[PDB]
Nucleic acid binder design. Structure first.
Lengths: 197, 171, 137, 36, 87, 191
RNA sequence: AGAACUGGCGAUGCGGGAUGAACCGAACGUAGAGUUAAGGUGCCGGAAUACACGCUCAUCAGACACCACAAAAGGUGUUAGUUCAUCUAGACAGCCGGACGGUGGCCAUGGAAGUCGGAAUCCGCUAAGGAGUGUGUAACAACUCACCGGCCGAAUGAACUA
RNA sequence: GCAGUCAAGCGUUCAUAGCGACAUUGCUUUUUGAUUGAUGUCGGCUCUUCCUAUCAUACCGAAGCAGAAUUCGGUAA
RNA sequence: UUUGCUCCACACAAUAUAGAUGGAUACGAAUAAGGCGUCCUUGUGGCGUCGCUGAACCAUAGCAGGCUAGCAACGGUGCACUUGGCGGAAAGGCCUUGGGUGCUUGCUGGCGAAUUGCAAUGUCAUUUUGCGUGGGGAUAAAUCAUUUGUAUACGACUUAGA
């Protein structure tokens, strides 16, 4: 219902998230996916790496600059999975893809917005315990992505700042909770509680 | 489907100088009486060469479970056909009714031995009165004093596409 | 100070006497008692006070509550009712934040348009008082 | 890490119909040899 | 034919070729320039008195072609800072 | 058979304390502290007293119950290492070229340096893992002692030392030179 | 392959099988509303990321032509069964004991003592102990397992079927 | 390959109504280690790319593999 | 180049919008675990409490929101300014200081609304481009042509020239 929906991609299964995002974009919702380096794929790391290497060997023989472009970054791997689920060669598909942004980490301005999750795509809710799974950052770094460390350092800095913000918010929440607990005995409090509030 | 148990009593076709045929009775688990009667004719012919025209069904009743809400251990003897020969199987099913146990058995046969309703014949369903008479450990396991177990990793159903908090699998 | 510490998990257990809340079907939103354990996924429950028929139910249809009481295994419906009233299960349920949250959801669903207007007015008044207090302290 | 070629699971119409004919012929010969 | 790593055989975008990799930095060392600019000014020949143990030309003199690069000192006129990004 | 519950016991002697939280295990005994991150296993830990700890798997399959006993044995090894330690004795033997083994310090770290193995001009360096101390046996010929709280560290150090002196492109029937684990025991051997 | 019958196609559009001569539905005036066939319902793409019970983890699974070819089998993967068995007058696994006497049986060998070789493989005492299951010595010896006992306590093993 | 030999198993259950995995006579053939090439409408060069069923180079496993050299095998284009 | 160019304010035009119609409402990590509160001998600590959906929370009354009289409190909030910081991942935003200026539905009053005729989006958002006013600001280059040869099929490239 929001004008823009920001999905924290951490702990999501790539294909189920891609299916959800594709339907939302086609239905007209603006979506920003952050932390694409923390997406999961079910199956062993060696298996998913083998699948990527098969993708890598696919190329146009007489001119490689024409063949499939193998993007290494996690955001681009997710974008590929999504474009496969959109009819991207039509004007409607292009307009749908114009409604999507995908990022590694959480850069500005989304680092101060609310992030949501997609429960039907969450690894902890979908995969059975004991099943091996792959992380997109490791897969990307093994296939040639070169910014894993930079993103990790930036995310550590963001987490430090976010922890400070949350400490201040926790203090203010405690103060407001006390101010409301001192008002639980009033006539307005009794009337509101009778009405359910 | 949702199974019912039918008692089916049939006999030979009466003729001249032929009174009192052999009243063959059977207990058939089926979704409805039409299927129960077809199954009865099939099993009658398999038991002995009695065609449908050579016979007549004199009775068919629905048998309800006597104590439908009492938990009972059932031993089920069956035999089923495959590409190989017919096989005989013994199974133990803990349930509150014979129809529930029979439905469980049909689903288990489909899941394990790829067999179907037309391939399974239910020889006998009997409640095992004594605890000590059970054999299968997947049934004997639920018979211990003060049984307790948790349900780890609870997965909650979500109605909406987006959730505004990480979910907990606690229970 | 030489005592070993192992953190424990307060898992709700499937056991005879455990109180469950039914969430789908005829008796959704009603309490029942686990009377027997049929298998890993089915239990025989019985909800005589709230009107739940004695039945075999998949554990997917109910949610375990943090309430338990002493119940003999395989107890019949009248015995379940006696133990239920003796253990005062309905009071234990009504005294919790979960049941109170359910009651609040139902009441808010039942509010009239005039009453939603009244709620807005009262919230503005309480807000005024509380903001004044927060600024003071 | 030189990943080799993988066999295609996309079935061709020619192979599918040839297999259908093979199965029919197999059944007819099974009946004839059971008679013999 | 040809080394496929030097494709495409197109004209350089500039007359001054770009330095695409500087030496890996070591912060403990003093501040130094990694590179310098000069103008190529012909070649000539030298006689070098070789000291190379193991060689057949150890303790013997060889004649080598050399290049002379005219390098008047460069003038420092600015500084630019770079930040690393996920891009 | 998909058992409802499976349990294993872990005994705790009178001197050691075990802290477990979210499947991180810290064992603190007379001789120090060990820490094991077991979050790759799916088990539940409980205690009834200060002497016994249960490890349980609920509704597990064959592989799950296979990991259960492994978890118990790993915690047992941590307890043993923190109470009695581990001592691996290795012997090096040669025919002609005497193997020279020293403890050197290269780049601020401990290395076992091996010189003149089969007459090699190559220097072999085996980094000493942290927590294991290297000694040379008294009144014993060509014996090196590796002692530590972590059996994993000690055994891997001994394995590294044994593998670094492999014989290449020769007959192992004829050429017997190498460093071999002579014995494995504890740091306390009262009886 | 040779016959005979009956269908399909030819002169034939439409729904479905991603696609298509012989596959699954259904045959056609122009329209509106409703319901369906075959086939489907994560997204492409209209339609349950429905409900339920099981199975499977593949270092290029599978999502099919199959009552077809590679297909006869191999596997210390996993599940469920059938028939044999042993078992608290003690099962399986482990430790510790015993594992004896003629006798170093008989023939060729420098030697060969259970264990380089060829022939019956015997008799006694036994809880139980092969004229020996393997390593091992020049021959021995030593260990070992076949078998029996003590130890603690509880079900275990084998062969087949899917 | 031919005939067999028994059968691991199977054959509507049926041992020689009948099949049948895996294993065992004789061949150009005589012993002591003697003398006893095809291809005509294809073929050249150059030259690109791909496969691996690897000749060489890299790393391993085994073998009376002393050393040297070699043999067989594994990964590997 | 007959005040050309550019940044502010109001004042009207034209433009076209993959699609405003209360608010995109900020810990991190785990899930065989956590959040919040409290306490201590300060940690993998003790106790209490919470989840079982955002069904929330905040906002939310007034001509699409007018004009006035008071009460209580000195809170809430907007606008033009100001103090002091902080944020470089794409910072372009967050927080704070002080005074001024309005509103206040926290409470009580007093006037207005009609006729859009029984509904008709019944026009309230924001992109850009021009024209007019009054408030300021700054006073270049590139190309051809000529020329060089570190370049060159033509383009292009590279030099030089008040």
């Amino acid at each position: 219902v929001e004008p823009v929906v920001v999905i924290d991609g951490k702990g999501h299964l790539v294909g189920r998230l891609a299916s959800v995002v594709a339907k939302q974009l086609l239905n007209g919702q603006k979506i920003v996916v952050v932390r694409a380096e923390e997406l999961n794929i079910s199956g062993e790391f060696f298996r998913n790496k083998l699948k990527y290497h098969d993708f890598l060997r696919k190329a146009t023989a007489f001119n490689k600059t024409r063949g499939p472009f193998h993007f290494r970054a996690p955001s681009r791997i997710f974008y590929k999975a999504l474009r496969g689920m959109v009819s991207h060669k039509t004007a409607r598909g292009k307009a749908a893809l114009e409604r999507l942004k995908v990022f590694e980490g959480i850069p500005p301005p989304y680092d101060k917005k609310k992030r949501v999750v997609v429960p039907q795509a969450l690894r902890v809710l979908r995969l059975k315990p004991g099943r091996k799974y792959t992380t997109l950052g490791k897969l990307s770094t093994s296939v040639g992505w070169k910014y894993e460390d930079v993103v990790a350092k930036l995310e550590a800095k963001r987490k430090v700042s976010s922890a400070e913000y949350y400490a201040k918010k926790r203090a203010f929440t405690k103060k407001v909770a006390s101010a409301n607990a001192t008002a639980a005995e009033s006539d307005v409090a009794k009337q509101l509680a009778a009405l359910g509030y | 489907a949702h199974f019912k148990e039918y008692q089916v009593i049939g006999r030979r076709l009466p003729t001249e100088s032929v009174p009192e045929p052999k009243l063959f009775r059977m207990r058939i688990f089926a979704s409805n009486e039409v299927i129960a009667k077809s199954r009865y004719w099939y099993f009658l012919q398999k038991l002995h060469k009695v065609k449908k025209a050579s016979g007549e069904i004199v009775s068919i009743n629905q048998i309800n479970e006597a104590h439908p809400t009492k938990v009972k251990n059932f031993g089920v003897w069956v035999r089923y056909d495959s590409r190989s020969g017919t096989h005989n199987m013994y199974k133990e099913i803990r349930d509150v009714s014979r129809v529930a146990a029979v439905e469980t058995l049909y689903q288990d046969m489909a899941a394990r031995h790829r067999a179907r309703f037309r391939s399974i014949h239910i020889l006998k369903v009997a409640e095992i009165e004594k605890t000590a008479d059970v054999k299968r450990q997947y049934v004997k396991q639920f018979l211990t004093k003060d049984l307790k177990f948790p349900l780890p990793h609870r997965v909650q159903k979500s109605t909406k596409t987006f959730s505004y908090k990480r979910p907990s699998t606690f229970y | 100070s030489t005592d070993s510490i192992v953190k424990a998990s307060n898992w709700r257990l499937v056991e005879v006497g455990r109180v469950v809340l039914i969430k789908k079907g005829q008796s959704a939103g009603k309490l029942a008692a686990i009377v027997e354990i049929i298998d890993q996924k089915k239990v025989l429950i019985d909800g005589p006070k709230a009107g739940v028929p004695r039945q075999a139910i998949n554990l997917g249809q109910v949610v375990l509550t943090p309430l338990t009481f002493a119940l003999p295994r395989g107890a019949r419906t009248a015995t379940v009712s006696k133990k239920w009233a003796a253990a005062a299960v309905c009071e234990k349920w009504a005294a919790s934040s979960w049941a109170k949250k359910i009651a609040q959801r139902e009441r808010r669903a039942a509010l009239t348009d005039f009453e939603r207007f009244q709620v807005m007015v009262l919230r503005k008044q309480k807000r005024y008082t509380v903001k004044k207090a927060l600024a003071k302290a | 890490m030189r990943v080799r070629k993988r066999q295609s699971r996309r079935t061709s119409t020619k192979l599918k119909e040839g297999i259908k004919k093979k199965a029919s012929a197999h059944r007819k010969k099974e009946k004839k040899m059971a008679k013999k | 034919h040809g080394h496929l790593g030097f494709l495409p055989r197109k004209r350089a975008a500039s007359i001054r070729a770009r330095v695409k990799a500087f030496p890996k930095d070591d912060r403990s060392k003093p501040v130094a320039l990694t590179s310098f600019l000069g103008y190529k000014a012909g070649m000539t020949t030298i006689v070098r008195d070789l000291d190379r143990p193991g060689s057949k030309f150890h303790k013997r003199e060889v004649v080598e072609a050399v290049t002379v690069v005219d390098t008047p000192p460069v003038v420092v006129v600015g500084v630019v800072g770079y930040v690393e990004t996920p891009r | 058979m998909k058992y409802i519950q499976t349990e294993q016991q872990i005994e705790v002697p009178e001197g050691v304390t075990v802290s477990i939280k979210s499947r991180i295990v810290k064992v603190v005994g007379p001789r120090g502290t060990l820490t094991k991150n077991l979050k790759h296993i799916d088990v539940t830990f409980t205690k009834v007293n200060n002497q016994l700890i249960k490890v349980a798997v609920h509704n597990g399959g064959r592989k799950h119950v296979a990991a259960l006993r492994t978890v118990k044995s790993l915690v047992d090894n941590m307890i043993t290492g923190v109470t009695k330690g581990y001592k691996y004795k290795m012997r090096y033997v040669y025919a002609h070229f005497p193997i020279n083994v020293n403890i050197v310090e290269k780049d601020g770290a401990k290395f076992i340096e091996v010189r003149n193995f089969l007459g090699d001009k190559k220097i072999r360096n085996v980094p000493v893992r942290d927590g294991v101390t290297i000694e040379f046996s008294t009144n014993v010929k060509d014996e090196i002692v590796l002692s530590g709280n972590s059996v994993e560290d000690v055994s891997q150090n001994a394995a590294d030392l044994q593998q670094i002196c492999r014989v290449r492109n020769k007959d192992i029937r004829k050429f017997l030179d190498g460093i071999y684990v002579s014995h494995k025991g504890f740091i306390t051997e009262d009886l």
